[PDB]
Design a protein around this nucleic acid. Structure first.
Ligand code: NEA
Length: 393
DNA sequence: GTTCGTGTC
DNA sequence: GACACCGAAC
Protein backbone atom coordinates (compact mmCIF):
# COMPACT_ATOMS: atom_id res chain seq x y z
CA UNK A 1 0.00 0.00 0.00
CA UNK A 2 3.11 2.18 -0.27
CA UNK A 3 5.25 3.47 -3.13
CA UNK A 4 8.87 4.53 -2.47
CA UNK A 5 9.49 8.27 -2.95
CA UNK A 6 11.82 7.76 -5.89
CA UNK A 7 9.29 5.57 -7.72
CA UNK A 8 6.66 8.31 -7.19
CA UNK A 9 9.13 10.95 -8.46
CA UNK A 10 10.00 8.88 -11.54
CA UNK A 11 6.31 8.32 -12.36
CA UNK A 12 5.42 12.02 -11.94
CA UNK A 13 8.35 12.86 -14.29
CA UNK A 14 6.57 10.68 -16.86
CA UNK A 15 3.12 12.25 -16.29
CA UNK A 16 1.51 15.03 -18.32
CA UNK A 17 -1.86 16.84 -18.35
CA UNK A 18 -3.17 20.01 -20.02
CA UNK A 19 -3.82 22.92 -17.67
CA UNK A 20 -7.30 22.72 -16.22
CA UNK A 21 -6.91 18.98 -16.84
CA UNK A 22 -8.58 16.20 -14.87
CA UNK A 23 -6.03 14.18 -12.87
CA UNK A 24 -7.05 10.92 -11.12
CA UNK A 25 -5.43 8.66 -8.52
CA UNK A 26 -7.37 5.35 -8.24
CA UNK A 27 -7.08 3.46 -4.92
CA UNK A 28 -5.65 6.68 -3.52
CA UNK A 29 -5.70 6.42 0.32
CA UNK A 30 -4.00 9.73 1.31
CA UNK A 31 -3.32 10.62 -2.38
CA UNK A 32 0.50 10.59 -2.60
CA UNK A 33 0.49 10.78 -6.42
CA UNK A 34 -2.00 13.67 -6.45
CA UNK A 35 0.23 15.46 -3.92
CA UNK A 36 3.45 14.74 -5.81
CA UNK A 37 1.90 15.80 -9.13
CA UNK A 38 0.57 19.04 -7.62
CA UNK A 39 3.96 19.75 -6.02
CA UNK A 40 5.76 19.27 -9.33
CA UNK A 41 3.31 20.93 -11.75
CA UNK A 42 1.27 23.31 -9.53
CA UNK A 43 -2.39 23.89 -8.79
CA UNK A 44 -4.08 24.45 -12.17
CA UNK A 45 -5.74 21.00 -12.49
CA UNK A 46 -8.84 19.22 -11.20
CA UNK A 47 -7.65 16.49 -8.78
CA UNK A 48 -9.75 13.39 -8.07
CA UNK A 49 -8.96 10.40 -5.82
CA UNK A 50 -11.06 7.22 -5.56
CA UNK A 51 -10.83 5.02 -2.45
CA UNK A 52 -12.93 2.06 -1.33
CA UNK A 53 -12.17 2.30 2.40
CA UNK A 54 -13.57 5.52 4.01
CA UNK A 55 -11.03 5.20 6.86
CA UNK A 56 -8.19 5.28 4.29
CA UNK A 57 -9.43 8.24 2.22
CA UNK A 58 -7.52 11.33 3.38
CA UNK A 59 -7.09 14.10 0.77
CA UNK A 60 -6.52 17.85 1.15
CA UNK A 61 -9.34 20.34 0.32
CA UNK A 62 -7.99 20.82 -3.21
CA UNK A 63 -8.83 17.23 -4.27
CA UNK A 64 -12.27 15.63 -4.85
CA UNK A 65 -12.50 12.37 -2.86
CA UNK A 66 -14.89 9.64 -3.98
CA UNK A 67 -15.83 6.63 -1.86
CA UNK A 68 -16.33 3.78 -4.30
CA UNK A 69 -15.06 0.56 -5.79
CA UNK A 70 -12.89 2.08 -8.55
CA UNK A 71 -13.60 -0.97 -10.73
CA UNK A 72 -17.39 -0.36 -10.60
CA UNK A 73 -17.25 3.45 -10.50
CA UNK A 74 -18.59 5.45 -13.47
CA UNK A 75 -17.61 9.14 -13.54
CA UNK A 76 -19.61 11.59 -15.65
CA UNK A 77 -16.47 12.67 -17.50
CA UNK A 78 -13.19 11.00 -18.58
CA UNK A 79 -9.66 11.96 -17.50
CA UNK A 80 -6.57 13.63 -18.90
CA UNK A 81 -4.15 11.90 -16.54
CA UNK A 82 -4.51 8.78 -14.40
CA UNK A 83 -1.66 7.76 -12.12
CA UNK A 84 -0.95 5.57 -9.15
CA UNK A 85 -0.17 2.23 -7.66
CA UNK A 86 -3.16 -0.12 -7.99
CA UNK A 87 -3.90 -3.04 -5.64
CA UNK A 88 -2.78 -6.51 -6.76
CA UNK A 89 -3.93 -10.04 -6.03
CA UNK A 90 -6.09 -12.88 -7.26
CA UNK A 91 -9.78 -12.74 -6.36
CA UNK A 92 -10.71 -16.10 -4.86
CA UNK A 93 -11.24 -18.37 -1.85
CA UNK A 94 -9.30 -17.25 1.25
CA UNK A 95 -7.59 -20.64 1.74
CA UNK A 96 -5.58 -19.97 -1.43
CA UNK A 97 -6.03 -16.37 -2.68
CA UNK A 98 -5.71 -12.95 -0.94
CA UNK A 99 -8.64 -10.95 -2.43
CA UNK A 100 -12.03 -11.72 -0.93
CA UNK A 101 -15.18 -10.37 -2.55
CA UNK A 102 -18.80 -11.51 -2.80
CA UNK A 103 -19.44 -13.74 -5.84
CA UNK A 104 -21.81 -11.08 -7.18
CA UNK A 105 -18.91 -8.55 -7.18
CA UNK A 106 -16.58 -10.94 -9.07
CA UNK A 107 -19.39 -11.58 -11.60
CA UNK A 108 -19.70 -7.81 -12.05
CA UNK A 109 -15.94 -7.59 -12.58
CA UNK A 110 -15.96 -10.27 -15.27
CA UNK A 111 -18.85 -8.47 -16.97
CA UNK A 112 -17.06 -5.09 -16.88
CA UNK A 113 -13.64 -6.21 -18.10
CA UNK A 114 -12.94 -7.62 -21.57
CA UNK A 115 -9.35 -8.45 -20.53
CA UNK A 116 -10.43 -10.66 -17.62
CA UNK A 117 -8.87 -14.06 -18.31
CA UNK A 118 -8.31 -17.12 -16.13
CA UNK A 119 -7.87 -16.28 -12.45
CA UNK A 120 -6.69 -12.80 -13.57
CA UNK A 121 -5.71 -10.08 -11.05
CA UNK A 122 -6.95 -6.83 -9.52
CA UNK A 123 -4.06 -4.97 -11.15
CA UNK A 124 -5.11 -6.14 -14.63
CA UNK A 125 -8.65 -4.91 -13.99
CA UNK A 126 -7.34 -1.56 -12.69
CA UNK A 127 -5.30 -1.15 -15.89
CA UNK A 128 -8.26 -1.89 -18.16
CA UNK A 129 -10.53 0.39 -16.07
CA UNK A 130 -8.00 3.26 -16.22
CA UNK A 131 -7.57 2.97 -20.00
CA UNK A 132 -11.38 3.04 -20.37
CA UNK A 133 -11.51 6.22 -18.24
CA UNK A 134 -8.99 8.10 -20.41
CA UNK A 135 -9.95 10.85 -22.83
CA UNK A 136 -8.42 10.32 -26.29
CA UNK A 137 -4.77 11.32 -25.97
CA UNK A 138 -4.98 10.83 -22.18
CA UNK A 139 -2.01 9.44 -20.25
CA UNK A 140 -1.88 6.68 -17.63
CA UNK A 141 1.15 6.10 -15.36
CA UNK A 142 0.92 3.00 -13.14
CA UNK A 143 3.42 0.90 -11.18
CA UNK A 144 2.43 -2.78 -11.37
CA UNK A 145 4.02 -6.25 -11.17
CA UNK A 146 6.02 -7.33 -14.25
CA UNK A 147 3.98 -10.56 -14.62
CA UNK A 148 1.72 -9.16 -17.37
CA UNK A 149 4.71 -8.83 -19.75
CA UNK A 150 4.81 -12.64 -20.20
CA UNK A 151 1.85 -14.48 -18.62
CA UNK A 152 -1.05 -16.03 -20.51
CA UNK A 153 -3.63 -14.58 -18.05
CA UNK A 154 -2.64 -11.13 -19.40
CA UNK A 155 -2.70 -11.91 -23.15
CA UNK A 156 -6.02 -10.08 -23.60
CA UNK A 157 -4.66 -7.17 -21.56
CA UNK A 158 -1.57 -6.88 -23.80
CA UNK A 159 -3.74 -7.07 -26.95
CA UNK A 160 -6.09 -4.43 -25.52
CA UNK A 161 -3.21 -2.00 -24.73
CA UNK A 162 -1.65 -2.62 -28.16
CA UNK A 163 -4.88 -1.57 -29.97
CA UNK A 164 -6.01 1.22 -27.59
CA UNK A 165 -2.88 3.38 -27.83
CA UNK A 166 0.90 3.51 -27.29
CA UNK A 167 2.72 1.79 -24.43
CA UNK A 168 6.03 2.42 -22.72
CA UNK A 169 7.21 -0.18 -20.19
CA UNK A 170 10.03 0.75 -17.77
CA UNK A 171 11.56 -2.11 -15.80
CA UNK A 172 12.31 -1.29 -12.15
CA UNK A 173 12.57 -4.78 -10.68
CA UNK A 174 12.48 -5.47 -6.97
CA UNK A 175 12.46 -1.91 -5.63
CA UNK A 176 9.83 -2.19 -2.89
CA UNK A 177 11.58 -3.04 0.40
CA UNK A 178 9.90 -5.90 2.30
CA UNK A 179 7.80 -6.68 -0.81
CA UNK A 180 8.87 -9.60 -3.05
CA UNK A 181 7.70 -8.22 -6.41
CA UNK A 182 9.51 -7.37 -9.63
CA UNK A 183 7.81 -4.18 -10.76
CA UNK A 184 7.48 -2.13 -13.95
CA UNK A 185 6.10 1.33 -14.68
CA UNK A 186 3.60 1.48 -17.53
CA UNK A 187 3.16 4.80 -19.33
CA UNK A 188 0.21 4.42 -21.73
CA UNK A 189 -1.30 7.12 -23.95
CA UNK A 190 -4.69 6.73 -25.58
CA UNK A 191 -3.37 7.55 -29.07
CA UNK A 192 -0.88 6.24 -31.61
CA UNK A 193 0.52 2.73 -31.30
CA UNK A 194 3.51 0.55 -30.61
CA UNK A 195 5.57 -0.46 -27.62
CA UNK A 196 8.75 1.09 -26.25
CA UNK A 197 10.75 -1.00 -23.75
CA UNK A 198 13.01 0.77 -21.25
CA UNK A 199 15.48 -0.35 -18.63
CA UNK A 200 16.13 1.88 -15.61
CA UNK A 201 19.03 2.78 -13.35
CA UNK A 202 18.88 4.32 -9.90
CA UNK A 203 19.75 8.03 -9.89
CA UNK A 204 19.73 11.09 -7.60
CA UNK A 205 16.39 12.02 -9.21
CA UNK A 206 15.37 8.40 -8.54
CA UNK A 207 15.42 6.35 -11.74
CA UNK A 208 17.00 7.16 -15.10
CA UNK A 209 15.26 5.40 -18.00
CA UNK A 210 17.36 3.74 -20.73
CA UNK A 211 15.71 2.91 -24.03
CA UNK A 212 16.13 -0.82 -24.65
CA UNK A 213 14.08 -1.64 -27.74
CA UNK A 214 11.16 -0.36 -29.78
CA UNK A 215 8.37 -2.45 -31.27
CA UNK A 216 6.38 -0.05 -33.44
CA UNK A 217 4.06 -2.81 -34.61
CA UNK A 218 3.34 -4.43 -31.22
CA UNK A 219 0.09 -6.40 -31.21
CA UNK A 220 0.23 -7.68 -27.63
CA UNK A 221 3.01 -10.26 -27.95
CA UNK A 222 4.94 -11.21 -24.81
CA UNK A 223 7.43 -8.50 -23.87
CA UNK A 224 11.05 -9.59 -23.46
CA UNK A 225 14.49 -8.04 -23.07
CA UNK A 226 16.04 -9.10 -26.39
CA UNK A 227 19.76 -8.73 -27.16
CA UNK A 228 21.95 -9.40 -30.19
CA UNK A 229 22.92 -12.69 -28.53
CA UNK A 230 19.34 -13.85 -27.67
CA UNK A 231 18.20 -13.02 -31.20
CA UNK A 232 21.17 -14.77 -32.82
CA UNK A 233 20.67 -17.94 -30.75
CA UNK A 234 16.95 -18.10 -31.57
CA UNK A 235 17.52 -17.81 -35.27
CA UNK A 236 20.52 -20.17 -35.24
CA UNK A 237 18.30 -22.94 -33.81
CA UNK A 238 14.63 -23.89 -33.90
CA UNK A 239 11.95 -23.71 -31.16
CA UNK A 240 11.86 -26.63 -28.72
CA UNK A 241 8.04 -26.51 -29.05
CA UNK A 242 8.25 -27.57 -32.70
CA UNK A 243 9.86 -30.89 -31.64
CA UNK A 244 7.81 -31.73 -28.54
CA UNK A 245 4.30 -31.67 -27.25
CA UNK A 246 4.50 -30.01 -23.84
CA UNK A 247 2.10 -31.23 -21.13
CA UNK A 248 1.83 -30.44 -17.44
CA UNK A 249 1.75 -33.03 -14.63
CA UNK A 250 -1.58 -34.22 -13.26
CA UNK A 251 -2.47 -31.96 -10.30
CA UNK A 252 -2.48 -32.90 -6.59
CA UNK A 253 -6.28 -33.47 -6.27
CA UNK A 254 -6.23 -35.85 -9.28
CA UNK A 255 -3.77 -38.01 -7.31
CA UNK A 256 -5.68 -37.60 -4.04
CA UNK A 257 -8.82 -38.98 -5.68
CA UNK A 258 -7.12 -41.96 -7.43
CA UNK A 259 -7.92 -45.34 -5.73
CA UNK A 260 -4.27 -46.58 -5.64
CA UNK A 261 -2.73 -43.44 -4.11
CA UNK A 262 -1.71 -43.64 -0.43
CA UNK A 263 -0.41 -41.17 2.17
CA UNK A 264 2.20 -43.68 3.37
CA UNK A 265 5.05 -45.69 1.82
CA UNK A 266 4.43 -49.42 1.36
CA UNK A 267 5.38 -52.51 -0.63
CA UNK A 268 5.14 -51.90 -4.39
CA UNK A 269 4.67 -48.15 -3.91
CA UNK A 270 6.79 -45.35 -5.26
CA UNK A 271 6.85 -41.62 -4.24
CA UNK A 272 4.75 -39.20 -6.30
CA UNK A 273 7.46 -36.78 -7.45
CA UNK A 274 7.42 -32.97 -7.25
CA UNK A 275 9.72 -30.18 -8.48
CA UNK A 276 11.96 -30.82 -5.47
CA UNK A 277 12.77 -34.22 -6.99
CA UNK A 278 13.93 -32.74 -10.29
CA UNK A 279 17.62 -31.78 -10.49
CA UNK A 280 19.79 -30.57 -13.38
CA UNK A 281 20.34 -33.76 -15.38
CA UNK A 282 19.07 -36.17 -12.70
CA UNK A 283 16.02 -37.20 -10.68
CA UNK A 284 15.96 -37.86 -6.94
CA UNK A 285 13.67 -40.91 -6.67
CA UNK A 286 14.20 -41.30 -2.89
CA UNK A 287 12.87 -38.35 -0.92
CA UNK A 288 9.11 -37.83 -0.86
CA UNK A 289 7.98 -34.20 -1.00
CA UNK A 290 4.33 -34.79 -1.97
CA UNK A 291 3.05 -36.87 0.96
CA UNK A 292 1.74 -39.29 -1.70
CA UNK A 293 2.76 -42.77 -2.85
CA UNK A 294 1.36 -45.05 -5.57
CA UNK A 295 2.12 -48.15 -7.68
CA UNK A 296 4.43 -46.88 -10.43
CA UNK A 297 2.61 -48.91 -13.08
CA UNK A 298 -0.76 -47.20 -12.39
CA UNK A 299 0.48 -43.63 -12.96
CA UNK A 300 -0.43 -43.93 -16.67
CA UNK A 301 -4.08 -43.94 -15.59
CA UNK A 302 -3.71 -40.23 -14.68
CA UNK A 303 -1.73 -39.31 -17.82
CA UNK A 304 -0.74 -41.76 -20.55
CA UNK A 305 2.74 -40.18 -20.82
CA UNK A 306 3.68 -41.43 -17.35
CA UNK A 307 4.06 -44.91 -18.91
CA UNK A 308 7.44 -44.29 -20.61
CA UNK A 309 10.73 -42.49 -19.95
CA UNK A 310 10.56 -38.89 -21.12
CA UNK A 311 12.01 -35.42 -20.66
CA UNK A 312 10.88 -33.44 -17.59
CA UNK A 313 11.51 -29.65 -17.33
CA UNK A 314 11.12 -27.51 -14.16
CA UNK A 315 8.37 -24.94 -13.67
CA UNK A 316 9.24 -23.42 -10.25
CA UNK A 317 12.98 -22.94 -9.85
CA UNK A 318 12.84 -19.33 -11.04
CA UNK A 319 14.00 -18.10 -14.46
CA UNK A 320 16.13 -21.15 -15.13
CA UNK A 321 16.00 -24.21 -17.39
CA UNK A 322 16.41 -27.34 -15.25
CA UNK A 323 15.90 -30.59 -17.20
CA UNK A 324 16.18 -34.37 -16.71
CA UNK A 325 15.36 -37.64 -18.45
CA UNK A 326 13.09 -39.63 -16.14
CA UNK A 327 14.41 -43.06 -17.06
CA UNK A 328 12.24 -44.83 -14.48
CA UNK A 329 8.94 -43.24 -15.66
CA UNK A 330 7.67 -42.33 -12.18
CA UNK A 331 4.46 -40.53 -11.25
CA UNK A 332 4.90 -36.73 -11.13
CA UNK A 333 2.59 -34.21 -9.44
CA UNK A 334 4.55 -31.23 -10.85
CA UNK A 335 6.60 -29.92 -13.81
CA UNK A 336 6.53 -29.96 -17.62
CA UNK A 337 6.62 -33.28 -19.45
CA UNK A 338 7.81 -33.19 -23.03
CA UNK A 339 6.78 -35.82 -25.57
CA UNK A 340 8.46 -36.00 -29.00
CA UNK A 341 6.24 -35.18 -31.97
CA UNK A 342 5.68 -37.67 -34.80
CA UNK A 343 8.96 -38.63 -36.50
CA UNK A 344 11.21 -36.71 -34.09
CA UNK A 345 14.31 -38.72 -33.12
CA UNK A 346 16.69 -37.23 -30.56
CA UNK A 347 19.40 -38.17 -28.11
CA UNK A 348 17.98 -37.57 -24.58
CA UNK A 349 21.41 -37.04 -23.01
CA UNK A 350 22.56 -34.46 -25.61
CA UNK A 351 19.35 -32.45 -25.28
CA UNK A 352 19.40 -32.58 -21.47
CA UNK A 353 23.00 -31.27 -21.44
CA UNK A 354 22.02 -28.44 -23.80
CA UNK A 355 18.95 -27.42 -21.74
CA UNK A 356 20.99 -27.39 -18.49
CA UNK A 357 23.87 -25.45 -20.06
CA UNK A 358 25.20 -22.14 -18.70
CA UNK A 359 24.40 -20.70 -22.16
CA UNK A 360 20.72 -21.62 -21.81
CA UNK A 361 20.50 -20.19 -18.25
CA UNK A 362 21.92 -16.87 -19.51
CA UNK A 363 19.51 -16.85 -22.47
CA UNK A 364 16.36 -17.07 -20.29
CA UNK A 365 17.73 -14.67 -17.59
CA UNK A 366 18.36 -12.07 -20.33
CA UNK A 367 14.94 -12.33 -21.98
CA UNK A 368 12.76 -12.74 -18.91
CA UNK A 369 14.85 -11.44 -15.97
CA UNK A 370 12.80 -11.87 -12.75
CA UNK A 371 9.31 -11.03 -14.14
CA UNK A 372 7.90 -14.27 -12.70
CA UNK A 373 9.20 -17.03 -10.34
CA UNK A 374 8.73 -19.71 -13.02
CA UNK A 375 9.89 -21.04 -16.33
CA UNK A 376 6.54 -20.79 -18.14
CA UNK A 377 5.25 -22.77 -21.13
CA UNK A 378 5.54 -19.69 -23.37
CA UNK A 379 9.25 -19.43 -22.45
CA UNK A 380 9.92 -23.19 -22.69
CA UNK A 381 8.38 -23.70 -26.15
CA UNK A 382 10.65 -20.94 -27.52
CA UNK A 383 13.94 -22.38 -26.19
CA UNK A 384 16.34 -22.70 -29.17
CA UNK A 385 17.58 -26.20 -30.06
CA UNK A 386 19.43 -27.63 -33.08
CA UNK A 387 17.45 -27.41 -36.35
CA UNK A 388 16.05 -30.80 -37.33
CA UNK A 389 15.52 -32.14 -40.83
CA UNK A 390 11.83 -31.64 -41.66
CA UNK A 391 11.43 -28.32 -39.76
CA UNK A 392 14.35 -25.86 -40.23
CA UNK A 393 14.61 -22.04 -39.73
C1' DG B 1 -5.98 -29.73 -19.02
C1' DT B 2 -3.13 -26.14 -16.69
C1' DT B 3 -2.42 -21.71 -14.45
C1' DC B 4 -0.67 -18.39 -10.84
C1' DG B 5 1.09 -16.31 -6.75
C1' DT B 6 3.78 -16.18 -0.39
C1' DG B 7 6.44 -19.03 2.52
C1' DT B 8 10.44 -20.89 4.44
C1' DC B 9 14.87 -20.83 6.18
C1' DG C 1 17.70 -14.37 -1.77
C1' DA C 2 17.15 -19.38 -3.48
C1' DC C 3 13.88 -22.49 -4.20
C1' DA C 4 9.76 -23.99 -3.85
C1' DC C 5 4.36 -24.04 -3.88
C1' DC C 6 -0.44 -26.76 -4.80
C1' DG C 7 -4.84 -26.36 -5.46
C1' DA C 8 -8.95 -23.06 -6.52
C1' DA C 9 -9.67 -21.17 -10.67
C1' DC C 10 -11.31 -21.46 -15.40
N1 NEA D 1 -2.47 2.88 -3.89
C1 NEA D 1 -1.72 2.19 -2.80
C2 NEA D 1 -1.73 0.66 -2.92
S1 NEA D 1 -3.35 -0.05 -3.31
C3 NEA D 1 -4.00 0.00 -1.61
C4 NEA D 1 -5.19 0.95 -1.41
O1 NEA D 1 -6.19 0.74 -2.38
C5 NEA D 1 -7.49 0.64 -1.81
N2 NEA D 1 -8.35 -0.23 -2.65
C6 NEA D 1 -8.34 -1.60 -2.74
N3 NEA D 1 -9.27 -1.95 -3.68
C7 NEA D 1 -9.88 -0.85 -4.16
C8 NEA D 1 -10.89 -0.63 -5.12
N4 NEA D 1 -11.47 -1.64 -5.76
N5 NEA D 1 -11.29 0.65 -5.40
C9 NEA D 1 -10.71 1.73 -4.77
N6 NEA D 1 -9.72 1.50 -3.84
C10 NEA D 1 -9.30 0.25 -3.53
C11 NEA D 1 -7.24 0.16 -0.40
O2 NEA D 1 -8.31 0.56 0.42
C12 NEA D 1 -5.90 0.79 -0.06
O3 NEA D 1 -6.01 2.10 0.47
Amino acid sequence: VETPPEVVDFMVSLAEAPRGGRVLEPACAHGPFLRAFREAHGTAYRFVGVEIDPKALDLPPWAEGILADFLLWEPGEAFDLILGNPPYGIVGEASKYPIHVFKAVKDLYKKAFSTWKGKYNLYGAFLEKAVRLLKPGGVLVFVVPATWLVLEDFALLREFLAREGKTSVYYLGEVFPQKKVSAVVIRFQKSGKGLSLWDTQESESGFTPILWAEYPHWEGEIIRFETEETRKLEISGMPLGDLFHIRFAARSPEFKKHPAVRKEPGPGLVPVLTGRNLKPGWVDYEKNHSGLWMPKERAKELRDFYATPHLVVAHTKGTRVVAAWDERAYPWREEFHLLPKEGVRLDPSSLVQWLNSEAMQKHVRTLYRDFVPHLTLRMLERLPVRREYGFHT
